[PDB]
């Protein structure tokens, strides 16, 4: 089996670990749907403001 197929199976395990472990599930879902970071948002504001 390829490295990609092994990578997907190991991801499926951590999907199962999200269902039992609630501290693990909160730390994953915190990052995903936060938005841009304060560092990146500083860069973006200059980029947007420089080109109107």
């Amino acid at each position: 089996e390829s490295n990609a197929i092994r990578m997907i199976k190991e991801a499926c395990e951590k999907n199962r670990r999200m269902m039992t472990d609630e501290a693990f599930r909160k730390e994953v879902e915190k990052r995903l749907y936060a938005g841009p970071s304060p560092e990146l948002l500083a860069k973006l504001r200059v980029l947007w403001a420089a080109n109107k």
Binding site: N3, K9, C12, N15, R16, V28, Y33, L47, N51
Partner: protein, 394 residues
């Protein structure tokens, strides 16, 4: 670095706001492509720009900054974000990296945990690129897969799958925190046509592309063989799924489980009245009595079985075949007792037999204005509902 293709305009009609957001989005993506891609790679949570995704690109547009605006502006900025992702896909492939041999496509219905699954993947030395996107209409993915095969890269496709209802619950939570959920129209369109697109891809490329699945209904079960992936993903037609989703989002709003803003983003551009009118009650009836009403469906064996029971007082005995109900003609008043109601339809016994009203009439909700067992007249004066009670005692 120019964009890989032209950004398709959508017609927003008289919506002047979205029309202007679209143009400002296309201008930004076209003119600042070099600086946008640089910020995507070096600064966002994208594995140095190896995780490629149109949804992550939306965060670099100014219209998408505020949480309140995301559901509204999404369709106006999407195509710019998608073409930037396509441009980014191509720029990653241009990097001369002999060690990196693998390209992974992640696809599936919105709210099935694709991005959470991608976070739970650990990057490897051989991983070149990971692209999250729809393959239900796979024409654009053909150009992507084609380029991978030109450079002798190993292409894998992961089809993540989940029930439409459980997936819809995950998009609600996403909408309330992130600000973007997903429309039922696109959820049904992806889920119904994803098996066709994968099969279409399979015929075209064969063993060169490897297609696997993840069943999220069975604790993230990995599905190795292509025939098993098609069985997992075969969860009904586009009419069925859209029908079930239309009733779900409406029921959830009527009960007070989701807000009006969550309901509207899920509704999207859909005319729900038109979806509800397509629903069939062909093998269905309602039995009434002093205790209440009982919904029953008949199976191929010709046995009626009870689906639902609703206690109501003051009804006489009766059997009503819902599949033989006359559709209410607009601009006419129908008088009589309501014998059954659900998310899609309202069934009223008149003196000219059983009559069926849509539960919505020009975005006004008929169902909430009447109760089962109640005697009413229902008429529409110039696209405005007129419901009068006819209850009396004498």
């Amino acid at each position: 670095v120019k964009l890989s293709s032209d950004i398709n305009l959508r017609d927003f009609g008289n919506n002047e706001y979205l029309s202007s957001v679209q143009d400002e989005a296309i201008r930004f993506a076209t003119e600042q492509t070099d600086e946008i891609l640089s910020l995507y790679s070096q600064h966002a949570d994208t594995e140095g720009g190896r995780y490629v995704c149109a949804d992550t690109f939306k965060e670099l547009f100014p219209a998408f900054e505020n949480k309140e605006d995301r559901a509204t502006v999404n369709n106006a900025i999407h195509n710019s974000a998608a073409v930037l992702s396509s441009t980014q896909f191509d720029e990653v492939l241009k990097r001369d990296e002999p060690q990196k041999k693998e390209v992974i496509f992640v696809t599936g219905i919105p709210g099935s945990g694709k991005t959470s699954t991608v976070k739970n993947m650990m990057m490897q030395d051989t991983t070149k690129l990971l692209f999250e996107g729809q393959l239900a209409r796979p024409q654009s993915a053909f150009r992507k897969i084609e380029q991978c095969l030109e450079r002798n890269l190993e292409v894998t496709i992961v089809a993540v799958s989940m029930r439409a209802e459980r997936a819809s619950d995950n998009t609600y939570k996403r909408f309330n925190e992130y600000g973007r959920g997903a429309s039922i129209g696109i959820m049904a369109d992806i889920q119904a046509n994803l098996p066709d697109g994968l099969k279409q891809i399979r015929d075209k490329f064969g063993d060169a592309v490897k297609i696997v699945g993840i069943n999220q209904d069975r604790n993230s079960e990995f599905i190795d063989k292509f025939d098993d992936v098609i069985k997992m993903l075969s969860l009904g037609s586009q009419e069925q799924i859209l029908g079930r989703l239309a009733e779900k989002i409406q029921s959830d709003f009527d009960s007070g489980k989701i807000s009006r803003e969550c309901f509207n983003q899920a509704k999207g551009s859909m005319d729900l009245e038109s979806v509800f009118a397509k629903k069939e009650y062909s093998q269905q009836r309602v039995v009434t009595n002093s205790k209440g009403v009982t919904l029953e469906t008949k199976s191929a064996n010709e046995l009626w079985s009870k689906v639902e029971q609703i206690p109501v007082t003051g009804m006489k005995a009766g059997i009503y075949l819902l599949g033989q109900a006359k559709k209410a003609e607009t601009g006419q008043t129908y008088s009589g007792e309501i014998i059954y109601k659900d998310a899609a339809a309202v069934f009223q016994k008149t003196k000219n037999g059983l009559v069926r009203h849509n539960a919505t009439h020009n975005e006004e909700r008929l169902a909430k204005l009447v109760e089962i067992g109640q005697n009413v007249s229902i008429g529409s004066n110039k696209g405005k509902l007129i419901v009068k009670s006819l209850e009396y005692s004498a």
